[PDB]
């Protein structure tokens, strides 16, 4: 907090917002939906829309970055970062991760003439994420790179899409109405076993304040000796255990779904930054359980002649927390057949339509969407990328 | 030290010990089948054959019985592929069913009702009945191992073994696997996999990560990194491809002395090895298994935890030919799921559907198609392919008895 910012906080550079415009966008009551000006066209006529959260942070902590890299060949790059505990990490990542990608790819650019080649691309991305973190880790001592962020990027390289995800953002393809998932989320519920095992193997990271076991609820001192249900790292099911003091510490993973936390602190298990993140008023470091390694899924743009409405949707959890893949698919396939297939603004409007269907409208009782469901109060950022440019 | 149990063949073969001797012939390789006089539960079929020479004993073991759980019926099939001795596989084939029975007794009352009970805002968590059975099996493997760990000092429980079991409990099948054996259901020609193998290839990242976290487990003779081939000293300083625990792809590294140690995982595929010793990563026993002439213990990298997959026998009215195949790697090392699927659906339509010996004949047919015939060019199967020289054990379980 004593250090200067590495970059000024801003919105994605491609929005071309002046800083009077940036202020007007930060409204928690009107929640203006920013879209991509028609004067500024993104690669592949990519559509983008975003909206600031309903009040839980003064800044929109999402960041987005979109440009065409050049490897000494062309490499298109889209990226989304969901910031938490500050905007520093996401801002930094949205400007620098592409250069770690470009440089890791330069190591193998020649070999990409003719171990499959795809596995070399995947390895470069995994190296780039590791190298983007670490740089945050070392420059942390010279700049205020606050907090951390999830990181979802995609590159088009020689006719294939690589979707690298480390966090809770999500990518799906809508190809002729059908949903092809391009990522899976990294939350305490989905990555329990890794965390529990690392706690079992290195129990000092639990700081005599947590247990690596998971129970159906909170265990009380009242209940010592009774047969309670437990789940260990090597288990997917549940069996009965007698409660033994150590079982009275706070569970390392507690909470059913979207409400589920690692050491009662963080609801996502992968991403960048958070290097000095510590437990709730404690001195236990969270980062030993966090990982900067992404999962990479490949889509080969050649196996199929895509249509005007065949799109890759990228969005932060702000979208997916209120909308299923099927609703998102419904909204796209309902909307895009109503815009002229030659309109370059066509996909930005689809991005806007999705954000609107997740943000909702403002009632006396809060933000509400369709069927009196509660709307998302998070930041929402949406990319609609038309696959037809990959044919 | 004495044996915990005598070496033998599966009890349901009713073999005398003269019959067991003639069965251990590495040249004739006789295919043993289930005598028609002895029916297994559900008229399950069984066949087996000894290896082509790599051990004097058939080191596979099998066990099949109907358990009774009391504070209900629980059908039980099991396969064990032993290595480095017969002791571990024998013990498990006699005792693991008792560990399953005992873990199930704790929850048997809960299981014949609705809702599971954690004892005996402010959110709780509901745990389905299936999740308690899964927890029992996982505990059972842990307890079967461990008992081997401690009784090891009083009896000669040699070696280790992989373990694939399946139980039928209240209309659901639970297939628990810890090793490289395999289970598939062949339902109306379609292949439903019910297991996945646990080998150095399939569990690379877990092993590398554990080696990274506790490098004392490598004793300065191995590196936790993987390379596309063996790293030579001549390549110190050069840019080579490597793969670490957090990677699915490959990137470039400078070779840095430590990268000259022996790879923790080496070998192309199924022929991949952990610390140059064992080609499977899960199962029982192996407690004093050490590295090739070393004092480094392997067991820290092995796991007795099984993967458990559930098949609901209620969702569909099975046919005479809808079967669950259990078999040791000896079958799958030369036969794909599709060949086995082809062979079952080709064979069974030729036996009367009420024939109780019908599925044993299919089991025998599968073993035959994997063992082959021996001329001069080796053991050869169809299309001049090289036959399996491992022990082979096959179960054909008719799913129709589960309707
Ligand atoms: Mg955020
Ligand atoms: Mg968020
Ligand atoms: Mg064997
Ligand atoms: Mg074998």
Author numbering:
A (entry chain B): 33 to 104, 142 to 183, 235 to 511
B (entry chain A): 35 to 105, 142 to 190, 229 to 511
Copy the relevant paper text.
Recent work has shown that the metal‐dependent protein phosphatase PPM1H counteracts LRRK2 by dephosphorylating Rabs. The crystal structure of PPM1H reveals a structurally conserved phosphatase fold that strikingly has evolved a 110‐residue flap domain adjacent to the active site. Cellular assays, crosslinking and 3‐D modelling suggest that the flap domain encodes the docking motif for phosphorylated Rabs. Therefore, PPM1H has acquired a Rab‐specific interaction domain within a conserved phosphatase fold.
Full‐length PPM1H expressed in E. coli cells was unstable and prone to degradation, thus difficult to crystallize. To design a crystallisable protein, the N‐terminal residues 1‐32 were eliminated due to predicted flexibility. We also introduced a D288A mutation (PPM1HDA) that destabilizes a third metal ion (Mg2+/Mn2+) at the active site. Previous studies of PPM1A (D146A) showed that this variant acts as a substrate‐trapping mutant (Debnath et al, 2018). Crystals were grown of PPM1HDA that diffracted to 3.1 Å resolution, but no crystals grew of the WT enzyme. The variants PPM1HDA, PPM1HWT‐LD, and PPM1HDA‐LD have identical 3‐D structures with two Mg2+ ions at the active site. However, all of the structures are identical with only minor differences arising from flexible loops and the presence or absence of the third metal ion at the active site. The asymmetric unit in all 4 structures is a dimer that is facilitated by interactions between α3 of the flap domains, as well as contacts between the flap domain (residues 356–360) and α2 of the catalytic domain.
